[PDB]
Amino acid sequence: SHMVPISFVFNRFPRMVRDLAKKMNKEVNFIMRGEDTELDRTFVEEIGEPLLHLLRNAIDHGIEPKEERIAKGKPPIGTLILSARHEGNNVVIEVEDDGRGIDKEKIIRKAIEKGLIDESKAATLSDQEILNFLFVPGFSTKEKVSEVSGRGVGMDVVKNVVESLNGSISIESEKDKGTKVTIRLPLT
Amino acid sequence: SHMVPISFVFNRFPRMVRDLAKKMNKEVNFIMRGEDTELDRTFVEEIGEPLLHLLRNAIDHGIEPKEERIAKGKPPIGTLILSARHEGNNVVIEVEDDGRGIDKEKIIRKAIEKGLIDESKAATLSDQEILNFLFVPGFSTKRGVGMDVVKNVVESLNGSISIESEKDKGTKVTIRLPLT
Ligand SMILES: Nc1ncnc2c1ncn2[C@@H]1O[C@H](COP(=O)(O)OP(=O)(O)NP(=O)(O)O)[C@@H](O)[C@H]1O
Ligand SMILES: Nc1ncnc2c1ncn2[C@@H]1O[C@H](COP(=O)(O)OP(=O)(O)O)[C@@H](O)[C@H]1O
Ligand SMILES: [Mg+2]
């Protein structure tokens, strides 16, 4: 229908990442790629808060303090990459950091706490099954709210919004390596 | 507390360079210097990707096919040099080729086409000013390209990168890494 460059969504992030990193005293080099990539104009408002949340998660939970990254033998400065591109009939948006990765042990503990799984079933969960708990509505306690809709935001809300746009989301994460979240939205 | 010879990352290039040259129909004499230069293990592990990008750039955009160098009145075989040395409290790595050199007019034309500068302004730019457009994200055409990825990885190591080039003489990319 009506395509516009994704820069309408991306433009405000450099400054927000700068301030967020400074507030949580993290050294972060923010990289944005493919701002010219176009998407439906009716996706602009809705995809913004969800993306901000993924960026916040990277800065807060992913990128470790300089001292910790040096101990791990990693580049002192963490890298946060926000990218967009066209891949077939879809707009692909990625948020990737080279931080400590999602604490899967913590996710399992939370899942058990929320009655989503029994402890006997947790030992054999695959990484994908574990990371997927993050998409269960109500999984995250929440606090950060969407300046657009007004609902608290967690990975569960991110997935819910992405599904509302008829798209999908996947997560990849390895301990001390980092986390990569990929969102695929339809072109039309 | 973990210095290690840069040879741990340099040793893998001779074969990469040869395969790239054959793939691109370029005849290149590859030279490596200061492979005994010690630097933080971390930098050694991370600098591989960037250096590969610079070496590939030299073999692709820089070194001209032997037939062209001959026609141009230059030594038939192209020369590509990868070196490391100490300069005060910094390790300096350089990738230099004696190719055609970065086309600065091409850069200027692109900047004008993208609306970054008008013609009058383009005429007053210094060479360094022109070359730095190569670092503007998105400036260059289609994992992340070459110069953008090189500068970002280098700066994540608290390093610095500069470019130098002369038409038909060649290009030299310099990377400065801190002492740990
Ligand atoms: N050694 C060189 N000699 C001549 N031109 C060069 C050299 N290195 C870089 N360039 C020029 O600088 C521009 C950009 O290099 P870079 O950012 O690595 O992009 P790329 O080579 O076009 N594409 P990609 O293959 O994605 O990295 C090139 O497109 C060339 O025009
Ligand atoms: N990029 C990331 N790096 C490391 N951990 C992450 C990342 N993104 C999310 N997480 C982890 O997943 C859990 C939940 O994320 P989410 O549902 O967005 O909740 P929250 O809003 O509480 O930050 C987080 O509490 C954190 O432990
Ligand atoms: Mg390149």
From Swiss-Prot, chain A:
Entry superkingdom: Bacteria
Cellular compartments annotated: Cytoplasm
Histidine kinase domain sequence ranges: 1-188
Function statement: Involved in the transmission of sensory signals from the chemoreceptors to the flagellar motors. CheA is autophosphorylated; it can transfer its phosphate group to either CheB or CheY.
Name listed for the protein in its UniProt record: Chemotaxis protein CheA
Part of the full-length chain shown: 353 to 540 of 671
Curated annotation (Swiss-Prot), chain B:
Gene name in the database record: cheA
Name of the protein in question: Chemotaxis protein CheA
Protein purpose: Involved in the transmission of sensory signals from the chemoreceptors to the flagellar motors. CheA is autophosphorylated; it can transfer its phosphate group to either CheB or CheY.
Histidine kinase domain ranges (all copies): 1-180
Source organism per UniProt: Thermotoga maritima (strain ATCC 43589 / DSM 3109 / JCM 10099 / NBRC 100826 / MSB8)
Localization: Cytoplasm
